[PDB]
Amino acid sequence: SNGQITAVIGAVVDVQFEDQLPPILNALEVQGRSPRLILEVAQHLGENTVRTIAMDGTEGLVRGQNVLDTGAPIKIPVGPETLGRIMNVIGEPIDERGPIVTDKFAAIHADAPEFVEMSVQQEILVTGIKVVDLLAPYAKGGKIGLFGGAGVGKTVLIMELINNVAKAHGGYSVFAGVGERTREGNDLYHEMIESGVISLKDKTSKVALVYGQMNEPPGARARVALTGLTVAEYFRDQEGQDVLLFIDNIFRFTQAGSEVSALLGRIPSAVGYQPTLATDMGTMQERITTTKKGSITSVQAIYVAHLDATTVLSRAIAELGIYPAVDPLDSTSRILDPNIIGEEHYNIARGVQKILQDYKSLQDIIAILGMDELSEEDKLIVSRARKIQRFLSQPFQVAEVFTGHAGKLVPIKDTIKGFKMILNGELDHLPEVAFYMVGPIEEVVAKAEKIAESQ
Amino acid sequence: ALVYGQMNEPPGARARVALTGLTVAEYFRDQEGQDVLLFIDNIFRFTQAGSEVSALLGRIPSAVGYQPTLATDMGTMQERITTTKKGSITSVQAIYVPADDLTDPAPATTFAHLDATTVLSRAIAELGIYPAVDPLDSTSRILDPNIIGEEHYNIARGVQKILQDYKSLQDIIAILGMDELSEEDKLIVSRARKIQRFLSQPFQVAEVFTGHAGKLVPIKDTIKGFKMILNGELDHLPEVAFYMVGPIEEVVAKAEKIAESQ
Amino acid sequence: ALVYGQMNEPPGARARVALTGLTVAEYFRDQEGQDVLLFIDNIFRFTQAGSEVSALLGRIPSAVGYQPTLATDMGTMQERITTTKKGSITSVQAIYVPADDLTDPAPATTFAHLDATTVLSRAIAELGIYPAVDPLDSTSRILDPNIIGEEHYNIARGVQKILQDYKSLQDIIAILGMDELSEEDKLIVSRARKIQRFLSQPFQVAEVFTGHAGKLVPIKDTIKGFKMILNGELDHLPEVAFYMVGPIEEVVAKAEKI
Amino acid sequence: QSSRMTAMDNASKNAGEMIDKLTMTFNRTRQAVITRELIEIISGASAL
Amino acid sequence: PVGEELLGRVVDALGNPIDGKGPIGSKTRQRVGVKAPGIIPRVSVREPMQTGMKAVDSLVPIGRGQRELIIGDRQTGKTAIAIDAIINQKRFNDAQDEKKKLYCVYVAIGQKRSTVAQIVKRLTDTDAMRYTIVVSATASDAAPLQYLAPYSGCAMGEFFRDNGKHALIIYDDLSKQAVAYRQMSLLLRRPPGREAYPGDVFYLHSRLLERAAKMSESNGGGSLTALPVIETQAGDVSAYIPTNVISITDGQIFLETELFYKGIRPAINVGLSVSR
Amino acid sequence: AEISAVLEEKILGAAPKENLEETGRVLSIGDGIARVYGLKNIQAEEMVEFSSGLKGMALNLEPDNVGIVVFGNDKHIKEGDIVKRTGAIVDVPVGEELLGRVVDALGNPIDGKGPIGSKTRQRVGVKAPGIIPRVSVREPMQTGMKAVDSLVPIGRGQRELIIGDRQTGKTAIAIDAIINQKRFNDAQDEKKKLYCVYVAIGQKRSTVAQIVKRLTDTDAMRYTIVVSATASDAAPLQYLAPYSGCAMGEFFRDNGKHALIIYDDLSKQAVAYRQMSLLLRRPPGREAYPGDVFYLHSRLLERAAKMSESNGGGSLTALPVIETQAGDVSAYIPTNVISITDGQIFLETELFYKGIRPAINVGLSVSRVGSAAQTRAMKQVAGSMKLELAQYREVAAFAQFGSDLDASTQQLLSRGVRLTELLKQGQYVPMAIEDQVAIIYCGVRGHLDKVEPSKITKFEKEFSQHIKTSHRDILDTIAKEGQISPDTDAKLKKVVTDFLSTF
Amino acid sequence: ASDAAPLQYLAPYSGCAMGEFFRDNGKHALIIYDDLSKQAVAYRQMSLLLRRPPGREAYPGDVFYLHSRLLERAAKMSESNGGGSLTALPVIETQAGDVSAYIPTNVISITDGQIFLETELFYKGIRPAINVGLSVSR
Ligand SMILES: Nc1ncnc2c1ncn2[C@@H]1O[C@H](COP(=O)(O)OP(=O)(O)OP(=O)(O)O)[C@@H](O)[C@H]1O
Ligand SMILES: Nc1ncnc2c1ncn2[C@@H]1O[C@H](COP(=O)(O)OP(=O)(O)OP(=O)(O)O)[C@@H](O)[C@H]1O
């Protein structure tokens, strides 16, 4: 179970064993490194030596150095103790908050759930965000693409997703910064501390963080998502919770897998990390699914291929004062079918989308000729569409100290009822500005009554 | 005689099937003194099978993924298709052009050994003219007043010029009409319609499916007929008398029957 | 002094004859303290003959089948051609671009080793303008308002802006013609065509090719003529009068002859 | 109306000629890209 | 394993049952690499294989014994077209006409296992499972299983073809099988070609798709109908694997992303859809 | 190792007395790569000394031999020569004594001004700071040019890329940023100072001499270190020069001071590392580059950050330069550096020859720090300026053939023309922040809509003189308040209207 | 076309030696290589079968040297060398009239002038279809 280093070429270490050869994906610890170096066995070369990828730096290694085989893959600490902490690939805490004292360790390479363990019903994960729950619903076990650039509240939306899932459903979240910048990671960590999702000394943390820097070797960044998925899998299997898994991002995960394949020299650089091919990404994608015990819902943070849902964040929506700045027309979902989410939900969503598209055409017509067109029917359409656009906005729990508005959690039935009443014109006599920054629809009625009493 | 190397065959069989058919044709030429016909369909599948054979041997591929021996493999296959002192082998080869690129190495290698061209046009088939051979896209290298003769060359050039004038005037007729054209233009478009109607011909092998008896028009009959149409000697006949008729005596006979039935 | 190793020579000889001419110029510069003129024609044959033997030296080829030490060999060759404190060398080197490509590694390496560049284009030579110098691809690093004069720099930048505007308009001109252009665009096109004709100049060595007498144009006459064209003082003249003439006085004389 | 029809006809003919030249350039660029990627894959595989 | 005991069962590429309903009772086993039928044992394709879609049954008709390609981008409706073709045969299999009955095979290659479970639920709900075999090689399955699953499903269909019955097989999708074979060929140190694909990916797909045929009346009169699926990226028809599959099959059905986002469902491009 | 001498001494059991643990002999030497037998106790990335006095670095530790990259001409190295390990990795001197000096990649002075009295040396392979010791970037790093200090702002501790084609002005942007800091280094406020490091990689010696002459004539050399790895230098020197310059800048960053590093250019370092990797028989990848060429630049550029107040508060802002061939930013090295850095500044040849200098493509240039890297007045005027420029670009995308346009469209087009003429700036003349704020404020408040654009530079040449002579109290009010108050806005509008009446 | 590639490569040099006989004996010889593009294709096949590194359009890097060492032997001798001469007329087949390709640009740089033939003029009956604007002689 003890081997010696034969060759050191970049982040690729060839290590020769004597008695027992470790299997593929096992972790081997170098015995002379003060920051310990874990090598993952990628292939067997024969002659009782194996080729391994390094999870840390390689400068200073000498040939013949002793390597101890752990007899298992990279076992990272899992549990409630990893909430609010930052871990590297191999589970060491890198937030200078002390050791991670836990009782549960789990290997980062596990099997996907079987064909009999999967639910035939394509349930949706309601997240309490009215625009998300209405126009682009989140499916349990689905793949979710979160778009947005600089100046938009993409980070605030991510933290609102974490807080709302931990509150409404009781399931935690895991963030995995696959090859992320140190400045962006520090900003995200401090924003998570400030907004109260990560709490120090109170044990009320809702997200577990796994980070991989850009100065890390390619092998280290290609297994950060596996570490985050392992923490999420502990929260799903051993607790029965619906767990969010934020990955930043799939593109950098594919890039790190392509760099690993280029270092190993077998697969050429033209082919890197297909969504299929369980060695590359098929196991990771199939371990993000909904089972009879729980579900893992993957959200990929994309900064501006197989996404079940997509929420596009636009600067123009934030320029109109609508928070969150989700574009209602560019946010699509495969789940928008009458056979899955119900006929009334699809009918309301299609009516809202049609009203918004007609409103954009009416705004173009008004900009061309003027505000008087097709009697008062177009004016009524414009008024209902503007009330819908105001009602799409919602205060955030995580941003109640930066904006001063108390965030609210809106169930899906409340959003359906409120938008149905707006479409039917039951609240058409209320002022437009009374529909702004309100969670439920009874809050809209109370806001309109307070406006009428004040004015 | 048929060979039919299928698409599920190994690449070696598909590469040598053209040589097998060429060997049967070479026996018909050398040991019988015949003018054999060889049909290859497709000739791009021959190149693709040769490329797969060379890639299975581990050789370094040439430009655009083809074998480095593409020119000499095509040359060795095609130089056995020639005319010798005993007989001749004439090859009609179906040609597929990948990605509609005539500068691709496989069509460009094929075009070096080509002595003619027969383009079958879908638009001509939509006009009811059979065979649907495009008279302008199809070309030949023996269009010369030393191989086919002065009269054949002049008549073919005159037919090509009239059809080119017709194609130029088709856009004008489509956008404006036909009444504003001059008398010369109306004579040109009438002769061109009669020329392109006379290009149609009944085939014996389709005579069950068509009901028209097939005709084998000799070359002097086609030369005389198109010379008559070019000179305006049949300006009084209707255009429908030229359709699906082999010779020109049957054109005037069909015109006489049309006049009598009218 | 002449040193010749030509294209009939083997690639070993063509890769070292430039160093022989450099050695003659270095002796005339250092050990004598003289002003030397060094003309090389052409550098690309040196850097191509270096690549012809690179495969026979057992080297891995570089991108587009070049020698992997092309940059370092060109650097060690070109750094010997310099003006030192002991003496001055003015060097004029021709460079060949294979298949009319400027992103080829050998000219792209040679670009950073030069002070003044004169890029010749085939498309300009197709238009009959001789010398076919690209006006928007030639740099000198002496083109500075504090070195060659403020008026000279301003005229040169104005000519380059006019020719860039004409190049941007050429896409619309090639489709919709001159009718869709505005009046300022027509003035831009007319002055740019006059500028392109006036950039051509009959050379004394090229007379046997053409028959025009070669003209030597003083730089004050050059900046005066281009200032006259940029100011619109010659908009009433045909552009053919601007073709193959040295000074602006020959432009006026040729216009009056027509 | 006649002048506008003739002007749009000339514009369409000029656009057709530009389309033909860009199509030839596109085919040449496509062949060069395929050849370059094949040579890069060959050089990557032959270094093992 | 082959037989009619596989109808209604969800099996993997090896034929092992994965639906949890118990072992299969097949008495016959058929090789996956069987040579395609020749020229004499087959006749011309004339029996209509009715998809049930108006645009397919009118503009690009599919006959019994024909390879018709369903090519398109992601999320365009290729699986929906294939599932509707499977569902449409219920009205023929219930009737007494033996020449109208069609037995279906659905080979899911490289898909998500939850999507295959939803497909099986949909076919069970519409009573189309009784004549359908589902062969699933998901993403978590190994690349050899994804390479083998089309040939396993083809052998199951060829049992019906050689027994006088008629079968329709769907390969959803063949691009995932080509990716799996590319990875196996690269890890076996085989010489690659364009896009690191080996020199016999065309031979792989041609020997797969030449087994769909209309047998002669002296050879039983049965038929096997293939509906391969190709997923393209940004409409790149000129890619290597789509070019090979287009050159193999007897026609293609093009699904357009632009038409799909306009709400035109099914998004069939009429000018690009060919049926020989 | 199976050579004839080794087989001879192993068959006979000679047991040779040469202890090759701390020394070695050269098996082969070629093109700056030495394969060395011996050096049993050598470590990776360690410096060695040859018998001719040349230095080398051990990059490949193979079981048979050691691969050494030679720091100099390989003519001095012969087969069988003795190589002695130094026992330490490469280090360079750091300190305030390097300011004003022109050094090579190893810290040796090449300006001829004698030695350097540096009392401290730092290794080049230092790990980058983690997520904890660094803080968010908010201090402005003022380049001094209006097109970049407003639209693509650069903060202290930010990796901002300058990417473009040849002869577009990337070096001009960098040198102008170095020159601009003389305003702050000559002042008394210590936190505003910025010490500069310029790393020339692969350039000719005449170009570096011209750069040093330009910095000496403008008195910017007194706070500037120039690290030179010229074209005739060895590939290990060109590869190691950015790391040595980064260590020199990290001395200022770790001592509570602020440093700015320019790598001109990282494309030459990538070419040099590609040559070393190809000659070491490492497996090539896309465009013959190794698989660690992303890790090379990421490791270099991750060390440029601003430290927290507990770590002294110092900063290190990097300005890498990338040369692009024919505008193809989809190549390997441009894609890597774009994915590493916190934003890019894109330069275009068409904008350069159109008169727009600096030729900054506003649409393609991003700054991820954004308005946090700006002062309050510059943020106030640039927020409106970027919106007006975006509106101008949107309305000019469909205004080539448009003549009878709308009045609002014509106003937007005219405003965009005024702003485009406003962003133009001459070479070697950096501008103060107050002058940029005043000129941009006049541009975006409609004060130049009635002014011909060709006179705007002359207006810039004169109105800045007007407020600096007769209306300096308004500038003092702006400096003390820190923002454009509406009363100061009205006073500035009155001054502008009076000046335009005089104009 | 049915011969081996080395024979196609050797034939221009064999003919050049036969013309060099008359060149060195005071006589005058005119030699025509129809065509050098097919010789370069044969030499490309020889180099690709020798596993030599391909360059522009998968051609070896000494194809310029191949044509230059062939065509430099055609020259005008002095009176002290017998007054002989050898005149070369190389033939190049282009694709779609592109003179910007690798081999045509090589032979243009080697030779003293070209006679360009246009397909457009050839289709209009202008024979010989010589482009006067492109065909020059130095
Ligand atoms: N004719 C149709 N009418 C309505 N919805 C349809 C239609 N065809 C497909 N859809 C819907 O479009 C979505 C995607 O279609 P489908 O999954 O069948 O396409 P696909 O090409 O198989 O996608 P993928 O590439 O993800 O496998 C589904 O939600 C499906 O319900
Ligand atoms: N803003 C400017 N105004 C006027 N001239 C300028 C400006 N910026 C650069 N130039 C001039 O443009 C030329 C090239 O610019 P510069 O050398 O800075 O570009 P570069 O990116 O360094 O190019 P290279 O690839 O040669 O290093 C020089 O003559 C310089 O004087």
Ligand SMILES: [Mg+2]
């Ligand atoms: Mg599908």
Ligand SMILES: [Mg+2]
């Ligand atoms: Mg520069």
